[PDB]
């Protein structure tokens, strides 16, 4: 018999993104080639099958630095990290291949699905 | 020119609640009278003006235990913590006064607004 506030989840995610932009309570650095990205482990886990596996591991859960596979493109990662914190995906002709490959590696099934759909159309 | 995944914020919050139920990456205990509640500091901050103030404080940001005012009812807190992680508010005739008082203390303005509306109707 609960009532529901429609905008609550969106407002929570917006505040988590504000914390990210101000570098508040970020507890991990994701290293992609030369580039470094600060984030919240819980948000990464909530969005990605790969980060979920990493941070539920009894040894890796305690690491402050995570290095991604050298094949991962920093721009593709940046676009996906923005999507995690906003629900908005900056998908473009020039980045779609790098975004799909990064989403497959990060195990973000809904992003992989839209990339496959957009590629098929062209 | 971004695209948006409508269900993303809700899915993120659902996974954060799953992490909470399994006590994964919880980094704070909220003490309310004799009762203890484990949570994620970032989620508390995203939902509450009070926790936002507490965890942006350079000294309090590092505390693993937070004790609430002794006037706060554990059940009212529990209902509000559930709302933070689900968007669902278990508002009932027998708990509405304790929920409104706890939401005013936690600075959860949308919950305070619905409690004031529901009280006015009765």
């Amino acid at each position: 018999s609960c009532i529901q506030f429609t905008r609550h989840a969106s407002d929570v995610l917006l505040n988590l993104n504000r914390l990210r932009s101000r570098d508040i309570l970020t507890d991990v650095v994701i290293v992609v080639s030369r580039e470094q990205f600060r984030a919240h482990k819980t948000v990464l886990m909530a969005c990605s099958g790969l980060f979920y596996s990493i941070f539920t591991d009894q040894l890796k859960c305690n690491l402050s630095v995570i290095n991604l596979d050298p094949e991962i493109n920093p721009e593709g990662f940046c676009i996906l990290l923005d999507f995690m914190y906003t629900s908005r995906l900056n998908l473009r002709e020039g980045n779609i291949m790098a975004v799909m490959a990064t989403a497959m590696y990060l195990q973000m099934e809904h992003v992989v699905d839209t990339c496959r759909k957009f590629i098929k159309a062209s | 020119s971004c695209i948006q995944f409508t269900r993303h914020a809700s899915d993120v919050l659902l996974n954060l609640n799953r992490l909470r139920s399994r006590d994964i990456l919880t980094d704070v205990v909220i003490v309310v009278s004799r009762e203890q509640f484990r949570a994620h500091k970032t989620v508390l901050m995203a939902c509450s003006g009070l926790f936002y103030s507490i965890f942006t404080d350079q000294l309090k940001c590092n505390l693993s235990v937070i004790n609430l005012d002794p006037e706060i009812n554990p059940e009212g807190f529990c209902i509000l913590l559930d709302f933070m992680y689900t968007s669902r508010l278990n508002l009932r005739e027998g708990n509405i006064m304790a929920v409104m008082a706890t939401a005013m203390y936690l600075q959860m303005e949308h919950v305070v607004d619905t409690c004031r509306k529901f009280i006015k109707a009765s």
Binding site: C2, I3, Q4, F5, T6 | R88
Partner: peptide
Amino acid sequence: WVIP
């Protein structure tokens, strides 16, 4: 607020 809605009835979910």
